[model samples]
Target: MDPETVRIALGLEERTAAWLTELDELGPPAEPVRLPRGEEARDLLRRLEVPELDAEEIVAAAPDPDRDPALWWLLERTHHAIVRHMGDHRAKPRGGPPLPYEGGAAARYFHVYVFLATVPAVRRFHAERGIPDEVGWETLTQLGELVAIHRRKYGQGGMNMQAWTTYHLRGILYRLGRLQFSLATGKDGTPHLGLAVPEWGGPLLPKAYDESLHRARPFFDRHFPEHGARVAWGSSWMLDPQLEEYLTEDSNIIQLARFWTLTDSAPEPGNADGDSSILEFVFRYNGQPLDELPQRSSLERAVIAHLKAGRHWHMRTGFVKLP
Candidate 1:
């Protein structure tokens, strides 16, 4: 087999494992609702009390409390719409590489990261708690199940990597904070030990943090430019629109780079395959284009460099190598 073919096959195997895991969690599908009429969609939004916070408000208030509930609802609805929208596009099969499976390692990694980073803070605030390992696992499991059932009922393929990643990232950071309280503080009566986020002094930490802060800025600037910086920052919860919009512009390279950097340090599936390589391909092929971000010619350049450097880094040690 050709080297690239082998690599693709390995990638598919990893993706298939993710699919099975997600499907198992999803269990049986529920019956689908009739397509919501335009009015019904509006009503749903109203019922959620959707807020009108723009990108700037989301980003600024993201790190703080007192964000608008309606904004959270709007973000959730918008996220669902974007997922459905992307599914519609994938269903038609465009000319480029076929859309990869929706429930895969890439999506799972994003889901886990967002939940860990965003959930603990909210848990701390409302319930005076933090996320425990069991709770974190359960949350991921529940999300997986929800995604599975929704896809089955709608007769849709699972969420693509970009849609799944973007949605969960936003949900953990924005919506879940309002809906779920933490248990670590004993205020919530839930019992689980919260995992401590590693300190920011490691070699990789500074670069990763800088990249995250930088990538996050453009979204707020472009979409909610009129909003005061404070408001814009607060609205970081509803990150889907900004992310979607970012994907359309050429500047999304930084966002993709940040994602890989953040996720590389965390636990995930297929760690043996070199998280960096898989992440690179994910950003280069699926994430970059799907979000409509401008293509970066040099995105894959790093991949080549990393592979050429030839160190048996922690994440790449056990994976098969192609000649």
Candidate 2:
């Protein structure tokens, strides 16, 4: 397929056009592309345990890759991206096109098919490297979690996590114990253990962090020793140092926050993204009136009161030396 023809068909803008060109240079899927359907599709969703409504919408859409140029391009390009960058710890995966919400089901769910189409290859990559099947399954199952997040935010069944999910499909991230870690590079181009806190509703207990961090050391040492990661780095609203004033020293989030040496090098923080993240993660709040936001919890009260006091919450960055 001509890249220019697909580009015109999708009407991709300059930014997405550049991203497409990058994925294009990676070439195409090594095997024929196939979109999961019927019982096969159902079984995949069942394994992932996707929410019933979202699963129904997805299976019903039955996206025909050939029928939509963007879908075909996404399926082919994402497959190549996954296979080519599989186990490549240094690779920085790019985000997908921001397809319009009003687009047809195929465009809305294009990246989902890209993920479904590459499951076998992902599993194969893991198996060939002797990584545990459980790890691979759990990592891929995160797609369901992401799908649920989409449904929660938008009241529908399409994905907007295409960029984040690429790390999982490309075999760079894993769920170890109570946390997720990716073999990733920091902004200064240094290799480090990158951290992600999944919304699994578990307390950010010290013991859980102990288990996750302990497991992370050897897991990467054995599977990805080439990266030689000696420090764990992360950036999130949770890491904002100002939280110490709101929460007691023993609070789980505060305890976790103290684990890092806060860094000043993160993006400039005038955006109040921290307030949005706090509201979203703590209350599952999305697009509702801020005045109506619940303040039953201390964190909730702190977030709302701080915002009301003409202050902003910042998303902060920090790093800890791996033990």
Candidate 3:
């Protein structure tokens, strides 16, 4: 395998450099990469519950997985990588291509095809281990939500968070109750339970978190006993302690922030994309003028006021040991 060529062609970053070795070990699939089309494709759309407009576009676009060599390699390689590490979160593959494919209309949906190809295997993994079918399907439905998010943001038929969904497709991350938890290796290279707050209908109340945390402990213990995770780690712009200045102590964000013990003594200038992250999570858009951003809520007002004043919010990291 020409690792250098694969790296340069796919525009994989240094962090994903490990994929070269992994892909080499995996080689290529014996059968050419195939994406569902026609009736099968329609059924997939139904199963995923993709938005009507996006589903129509996806059908019309009908990406042929074997059309591009580099993209094909990435799809198959990532699929094999997930399959190889199925149910073994302790040594899950490190990173993936930072963004979705940018080649063309159909090609932009390559990652969707990647996930679709692996669904059967991951579903079998879930079944063999007695994971509820509803849970498995609901977790995989995040793909449809992402498709909807893409259309909302860009007014186009596409996908985002390609890398994030890798865990869901690999049967590692799960949407339990109001929150999502997964077994992962933190930045310090220690295994821990990871927490992700999905931008769905769930309210971020302490009661919801309490139940979710309660469910998580047994969920992992019963399924992923190999990774004995005792602490829950989360890293996000929401974890920034600065929010306390603008929000009341009783606010949901503040209340949730109280759970974590800040990992960084000095996390100033933490993630360079902190403001953009806020925009994406709160406002659902980014790169807008400061004056144009809505001040509908305290959090929104705080974000706009801070950015306008030449101050910044940093994406901080923190952990809380589980009971």
TM-score of each: 0.24, 0.89, 0.84
Please give, for residues 166-238, the per-residue lDDT of candidate 3 as tens digits.
Answer: 7887788888878888878865767788899877646798998888888877888887777778889888988
Cα lDDT of model 1 by residue, 259-294, tens digit: 321212333433344433334332422333333533
Clashing pairs in 3: none
Better candidate by TM-score, 2 or 3? 2
- Compare the candidates by TM-score and give the number of the best one: 2
Backbone clashes, candidate 3: 0
Q: Model 3: runs farther than 4 Å from truth?
A: 1-25, 30-34, 65-74, 90-102, 186-190, 269-273
lDDT of each: 0.28, 0.78, 0.76
Model 1's number of clashes is 29
Clashes within 3 Å, all models in order: 29, 0, 0
- Reference-based TM-score, model 2: 0.89
Better of 1 and 2 by TM-score: 2
lDDT of residue 124 for candidate 3:
93
Clash pairs detected, candidate 2: none
Candidate 3 residue 102 Cα shift, in angstroms, is 6.6
Which candidate would rank higher by lDDT, 1 or 3? 3
